[PDB]
Amino acid sequence: AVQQNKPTRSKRGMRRSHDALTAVTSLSVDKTSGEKHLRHHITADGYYRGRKVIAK
Template sequence: MAVQKSKKSVSRRGMRRSHDAMDEPTLSTDSMTGELHKRHQVTATGYYRGKKVVNVKVAS
């Protein structure tokens, strides 16, 4: 089992943990439908930046 040579300071521990926080996803409003979607992602209806890029099949 690995054992550290010396104690890590509270400051070092805090610096390591500073990257562990969860961020809320950045949302954008689609100009065609007005729905919210994640940035740089195709919407559920298949639009990206106001243009139809994917043909979405309707589930029946």
């Protein structure tokens, strides 16, 4: 139920070798508005594939 010995800082680091985050490979660029956005997501200004989706 509980440890018999204190795990080392080395063991702690090994377990965390899979905890690293992965950055987005790249951001798509709207053809009309020109700003960058997550692929398949609307831009901050309400554009998507240069169609000017609702922006209110």
